[PDB]
Amino acid sequence: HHQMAEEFVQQRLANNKVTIFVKYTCPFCRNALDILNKFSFKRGAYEIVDIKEFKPENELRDYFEQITGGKTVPRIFFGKTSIGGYSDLLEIDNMDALGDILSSIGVLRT
Protein backbone atom coordinates (compact mmCIF):
# COMPACT_ATOMS: atom_id res chain seq x y z
CA HIS A 1 0.00 0.00 0.00
CA HIS A 2 3.06 2.27 -0.07
CA GLN A 3 5.88 2.95 -2.64
CA MET A 4 9.14 3.60 -0.78
CA ALA A 5 10.72 7.00 -1.48
CA GLU A 6 13.92 5.17 -2.34
CA GLU A 7 12.16 3.26 -5.14
CA PHE A 8 10.38 6.38 -6.40
CA VAL A 9 13.73 8.07 -6.81
CA GLN A 10 15.98 5.23 -7.94
CA GLN A 11 13.49 3.99 -10.58
CA ARG A 12 13.89 7.35 -12.38
CA LEU A 13 17.74 7.35 -12.39
CA ALA A 14 20.02 5.91 -15.10
CA ASN A 15 23.76 6.11 -15.83
CA ASN A 16 23.44 8.27 -18.93
CA LYS A 17 20.54 10.50 -17.94
CA VAL A 18 19.82 13.80 -16.22
CA THR A 19 17.03 13.58 -13.65
CA ILE A 20 15.60 16.64 -11.84
CA PHE A 21 13.02 16.40 -9.06
CA VAL A 22 10.77 19.47 -8.86
CA LYS A 23 7.63 21.09 -7.56
CA TYR A 24 6.25 23.46 -10.16
CA THR A 25 5.39 26.14 -7.65
CA CYS A 26 9.06 26.58 -6.54
CA PRO A 27 10.97 29.47 -8.24
CA PHE A 28 14.35 27.83 -7.68
CA CYS A 29 12.97 24.82 -9.55
CA ARG A 30 12.01 26.88 -12.61
CA ASN A 31 15.39 28.62 -12.50
CA ALA A 32 17.14 25.23 -12.56
CA LEU A 33 14.91 24.01 -15.36
CA ASP A 34 15.79 27.11 -17.30
CA ILE A 35 19.47 26.27 -17.12
CA LEU A 36 18.95 22.67 -18.32
CA ASN A 37 16.56 23.71 -21.06
CA LYS A 38 19.47 25.48 -22.82
CA PHE A 39 20.61 22.04 -23.97
CA SER A 40 19.25 19.40 -26.35
CA PHE A 41 19.09 15.91 -24.92
CA LYS A 42 19.03 12.43 -26.36
CA ARG A 43 15.79 10.47 -26.25
CA GLY A 44 15.15 9.39 -22.65
CA ALA A 45 18.33 11.13 -21.30
CA TYR A 46 16.45 13.90 -19.48
CA GLU A 47 13.47 13.55 -17.12
CA ILE A 48 11.66 16.22 -15.09
CA VAL A 49 10.01 14.49 -12.12
CA ASP A 50 7.08 16.14 -10.28
CA ILE A 51 7.40 15.15 -6.61
CA LYS A 52 3.75 15.98 -5.89
CA GLU A 53 3.33 12.42 -7.25
CA PHE A 54 4.79 11.10 -3.98
CA LYS A 55 3.15 10.75 -0.57
CA PRO A 56 3.96 11.23 2.18
CA GLU A 57 6.19 14.18 1.30
CA ASN A 58 8.23 13.92 4.46
CA GLU A 59 9.40 10.41 3.63
CA LEU A 60 10.76 11.64 0.28
CA ARG A 61 12.37 14.66 1.93
CA ASP A 62 14.01 12.39 4.47
CA TYR A 63 15.36 10.14 1.72
CA PHE A 64 16.71 13.06 -0.36
CA GLU A 65 18.56 14.25 2.83
CA GLN A 66 20.32 10.85 3.28
CA ILE A 67 21.49 10.52 -0.32
CA THR A 68 21.86 14.15 -1.32
CA GLY A 69 22.45 16.06 1.93
CA GLY A 70 19.39 18.31 1.43
CA LYS A 71 15.63 17.89 1.64
CA THR A 72 14.20 20.42 -0.68
CA VAL A 73 13.61 20.56 -4.42
CA PRO A 74 15.09 20.88 -6.89
CA ARG A 75 17.24 17.79 -6.44
CA ILE A 76 19.46 17.25 -9.51
CA PHE A 77 21.05 13.98 -10.57
CA PHE A 78 23.68 13.55 -13.27
CA GLY A 79 23.56 9.83 -13.85
CA LYS A 80 22.97 8.21 -10.44
CA THR A 81 25.00 10.86 -8.70
CA SER A 82 23.47 13.77 -6.88
CA ILE A 83 24.69 17.22 -7.84
CA GLY A 84 22.63 18.94 -5.16
CA GLY A 85 20.31 21.84 -5.96
CA TYR A 86 19.80 25.07 -7.82
CA SER A 87 22.90 26.77 -6.38
CA ASP A 88 25.07 23.82 -7.30
CA LEU A 89 23.87 23.86 -10.86
CA LEU A 90 24.30 27.62 -11.17
CA GLU A 91 27.87 27.34 -9.94
CA ILE A 92 28.74 24.76 -12.61
CA ASP A 93 26.86 26.77 -15.27
CA ASN A 94 28.61 30.05 -14.33
CA MET A 95 32.06 28.55 -14.64
CA ASP A 96 31.22 27.10 -18.09
CA ALA A 97 31.70 23.48 -16.88
CA LEU A 98 28.12 22.25 -17.49
CA GLY A 99 28.61 21.63 -21.20
CA ASP A 100 31.69 19.51 -20.71
CA ILE A 101 30.00 17.51 -17.94
CA LEU A 102 26.83 16.90 -19.96
CA SER A 103 29.02 15.79 -22.93
CA SER A 104 30.91 13.35 -20.69
CA ILE A 105 27.81 11.65 -19.32
CA GLY A 106 26.38 11.03 -22.78
CA VAL A 107 23.11 12.84 -22.56
CA LEU A 108 23.54 15.49 -25.23
CA ARG A 109 22.01 15.21 -28.67
CA THR A 110 24.93 14.86 -31.11
Question: What is the residue-wise DSSP string for the chain?
Answer: ----HHHHHHTT--TT-EEEEE-TT-HHHHHHHHHHTTS-B-TTSEEEEEGGGSSSHHHHHHHHHHHHS--SS-EEEETTEEEESHHHHHHHHHTT-HHHHHHHTT-B--
- Cα dihedral sign, 46-100-86-25: negative
Please answer whether residues 23 and 49 qualify as being in contact, where contact means their C-beta atoms are separated by less than 8 angstroms: no
CA 23/CA 53 separation, integer angstroms: 10
Cβ–Cβ < 8 Å for 61, 67:
no
CATH class given for the domain over 1-110: alpha beta
Tell me the resolution in Å: 1.8
